[PDB]
Amino acid sequence: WKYENLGTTGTKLVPLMMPKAGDNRKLVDFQVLFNNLVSTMLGDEDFGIMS
Amino acid sequence: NFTPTPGESYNKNSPINIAAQNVYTYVRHMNSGHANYEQADLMMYLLAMD
Amino acid sequence: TRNDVAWYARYPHILEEATRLPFAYPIGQYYDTGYSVASATEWSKYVDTSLTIPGVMCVNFTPTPGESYNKNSPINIAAQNVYTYVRHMNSGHANYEQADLMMYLLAMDSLYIFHSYVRKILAISKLYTPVNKYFPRALLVALGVDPEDVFANQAQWEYFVNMVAYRAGAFAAPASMTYYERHAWMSNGLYVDQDVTRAQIYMFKPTMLWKYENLGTTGTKLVPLMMPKAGDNRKLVDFQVLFNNLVSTMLGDEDFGIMSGDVFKAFGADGLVKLLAVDSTTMTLPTYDPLILAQIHSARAVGAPILETSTLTGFPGRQWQITQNPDVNNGAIIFHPSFGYDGQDHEELSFRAMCSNMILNLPGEAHSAEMIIEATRLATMFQVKAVPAGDTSKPVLYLPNGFGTEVVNDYTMISVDKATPHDLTIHTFFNNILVPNAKENYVANLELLNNIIQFDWAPQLYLTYGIAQESFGPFAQLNDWTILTGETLARMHEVCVTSMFDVPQMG
Amino acid sequence: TRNDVAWYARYPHILEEATRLPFAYPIGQYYDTGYSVASATEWSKYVDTSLTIPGVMCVNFTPTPGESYNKNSPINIAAQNVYTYVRHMNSGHANYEQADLMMYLLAMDSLYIFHSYVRKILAISKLYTPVNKYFPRALLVALGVDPEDVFANQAQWEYFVNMVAYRAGAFAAPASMTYYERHAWMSNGLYVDQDVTRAQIYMFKPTMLWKYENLGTTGTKLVPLMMPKAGDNRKLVDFQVLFNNLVSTMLGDEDFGIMSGDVFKAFGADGLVKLLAVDSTTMTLPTYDPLILAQIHSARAVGAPILETSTLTGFPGRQWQITQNPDVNNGAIIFHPSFGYDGQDHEELSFRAMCSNMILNLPGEAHSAEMIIEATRLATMFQVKAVPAGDTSKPVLYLPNGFGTEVVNDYTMISVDKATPHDLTIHTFFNNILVPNAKENYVANLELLNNIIQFDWAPQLYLTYGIAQESFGPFAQLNDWTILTGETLARMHEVCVTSMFDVPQMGFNK
Amino acid sequence: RYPHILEEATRLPFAYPIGQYYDTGYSVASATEWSKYVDTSLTIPGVMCV
Amino acid sequence: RYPHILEEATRLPFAYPIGQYYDTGYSVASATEWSKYVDTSLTIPGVMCV
């Protein structure tokens, strides 16, 4: 579940698909996935206040 | 191959909404929390951490 | 001569494994039973798979001083009694009369009911049960508050209720005058219909309160101030302007301070009505009280309060008013409301079913005098019809044969919707329910009836139909009933109005 | 919480004089409430002054051996066990099979039920009470008997009951088989709903009994013999004709004589069912039994029995029958009855409301296994529709998913009328009630509902409105409940039918 | 904290007798339009003779 | 004598986390016409490197 902020009209959790069992993904793909996951969380001050 | 879920939720009487109310009461009121977010925001932060 | 072992004791594991079923379903929750045939989905509404169980029935009441037509009324005799008690305990020349003191003493009751109401709104919000999902939001919706405003603004709500208790606690009122203790007992308390964990809850909410409205040399006139109804999502600003409208004429006023100080000198500080304080740990638990349940079971709803803005075609000047005027009835406190109103300037044809003699029903077979007279408190019977003026009148009004220290206006029931998203449903009704001729409201009326019979001591229903031109009588289960005529209920009402307003011994 | 009012203690004389009220109105007669508003006679039917409290709800049942469509049924397992004990463990005769012995044991139960029936008719007629004017005539009307006949011919009734108990002793049947004890305990008791003075009364009456039929070498039947219904006003001669018709094919059959002597030899005279004698001093007082009330609550009426003269378009061969044939179906006893019949050749569309899963609610919060297994004895859930033989079919029939030792056909409630004679009213109804679109059906249905809610552990109602094409679900006050599906109730039915037909007097499982 | 809730939700009848046909029933119940595509039967054998 | 009213009137959110911008808001709601003459900003610094 990837966090999505819509502002005053709500807040989503959207799917972020993981690699499947034939994909042969390197470390750079998992680093891109982790950067895409925490992208909308470390710069949000709503998340900082709640944290 | 699994998908993490908060449970099925279509009204306020859901387990995730009851848990949202409980954790928002403990964080916001029993401890002096901030007032710029609601219970659904705190629960979705707790769901995004998982 | 040897009795052999039975089958259930020869195979106890078979019996205990076949009968292991999950009981104690949480209420506050929609349940689908499913189909046992499963081909019956072709029979769409002819198969009912829904199971909704209600949780809250709120009794919506109006506090009254009893019926009053002259100075021989029990409220005026009580005014005389309490005024000669207070005046003969206070050295000096008073500036107020007996009627001013009794009108102060009723306005203080409306303040104390307001404080118990907002403290109930506060103390409900901390209730949680896993097996009751109506807690606390259905209780808050039934009291007419926005439930999210109480959780979001909890400290401001606590400040408001503590300031109401501080500002209304500055006035004195006698503690040994059971009117205050009874109204506090009703307004502070959640009542289960049965002493179980998944029980249905009864509440008491004021429909209106009495606002003082000083007039000067032309007397004193307690006016209605309507409370928020269930479904109104009222916030703290609305309850604040309601409190400010209730105290605008008596907060920093000299006459109310003089009357309060005279009551404070007459009755000691131990003899005054104490308002409960509320912290963040204050909780009211649902209790089992058979006296509450006995008077709910024999409650009869009188209808909506008539206001000065309420339009009634053939009835002008019938608004509910506790009045006082030295020009009228020799300065007596006057209150005689007419009943059978619901808004909606037309005749509510279902109030004709309230013209029978009531049935007072109790459980067991031995009934004490205290139980019998406590079970008749919310009961009000009509006596005659009010006379219109103009030979063209749309509603039909009724005069009672006396009433207690409070009358019931309405009942509001909170259940769960059987349609998605299964939110709370709000149904307001009298004892008398009209079922007009349309296909929508037959199954809806049956759902209301099945919802009402879940409540163990629910008020007795009277149902009229449109095409039938016919009312059906008391829809309730009876155990040990008697038939009350209006004169027996009038005598019990006069006894209980006298007992509520009674002052101790000295002069 | 509400300190007591000190004014009531200081003036108890005024409180006692103001609250002298006539409670304990005797039930059995009409009461008028009167008028609070004396001018409300102009609003004639919009004011209800009537108060009709009912007294009797008769549960009309059919005794069953359980559902049986193969040899693995509980009745066939019981047939094998009792035939092994009678034929082989004791030296029995070899001219009959296990299905013959089991059908003899099933035909004896109808005799025992008939004896309990006429014994309850006799014991009711001596009951008169100042507090309950339903006694005894409403109980006698609900059982189908002319109540003046039992009064005028009390000695003849009293000796006929004893003669039934005497002539039933020509046939031997085991006493540890709790099928007989259950049916005798059901069809004789007067059951009170709340354990107070003028409480409501539940009875159990057989709708039909199983009459024995011998086809010779091509099988053996049990066919229905209909009992009188609650308006019939039957004299003693009708009940004597019914008892003569019941034992007509049993006392002259030497297969039954051989099987009777074999059961007598195998179990001994001390281990047989003893229908006990009644004297002139024999009374039944009504009892409080929360197991019986838990049976009546959550009971499910399956409809009328289907007879061979019954007219069912699209269903020509669906008459209720306990049949065995050595050529058919491994020689197993077959009872596969269709349900949902209303006595007419059309679709009773309120039985469509019996197609959802049932609710079983019990008192309290701690239910024992014995209590849960007892409370499901009259519950019957439909499973599938029957297949119509053809394409045109007016009724809709239902196959169950098993049933207990008895199915409910009907309920009959006796109440007083609200119109000016104020006589006894007889209403018969299922759990499912159709309210058709007519101007006079809604107030009558509401009176039926309000009479039903006087009975404490009443059956749960399912009301269908013809104007809305919509049914409403279980009209009852709930408690600690579950949702039962068909397989759980089928497992409980399997358990109880196995436990009823078990004879511990046998040499089995020691 | 709620052992009664757990013990009441999990009381199921185990130990079904073998030698017996079992119908599982439908969980969707509209699926009777899908006649043999839904399998509700449960047969368990008892004897394998060598 | 009235510590409940004192506790309810002084439930204040202290311990604002430093590192982010805070807006104070407007005591006078019409003071947006005086745009830069009203300062609603609060920027607390964290690091001074010598």
UniProtKB/Swiss-Prot annotation, chain B:
Q: Which domain of life is it from?
A: Viruses
Entry function: The capsid protein self-assembles to form an icosahedral capsid with a T=2 symmetry made of 120 subunits.
How does it get modified post-translation? The 7 kDa polypeptide is acetylated. Autocatalytic proteolysis releases a post-translationally modified peptide that remains associated with nucleic acid within the virion. This peptide is observed only when nucleic acid is packaged in the capsid.
Q: What is the protein's given name? A: Capsid protein precursor
**Which organism does this record belong to?**
Human picobirnavirus (strain Human/Thailand/Hy005102/-)
Please describe the quaternary structure of this protein: Homodimer.
Which residues constitute the signal peptide according to the record? none
* Complete-protein stretch covered: 102 to 151 of 552
> What remark does the entry add?
Picobirnavirus particles are capable of disrupting biological membranes in vitro.
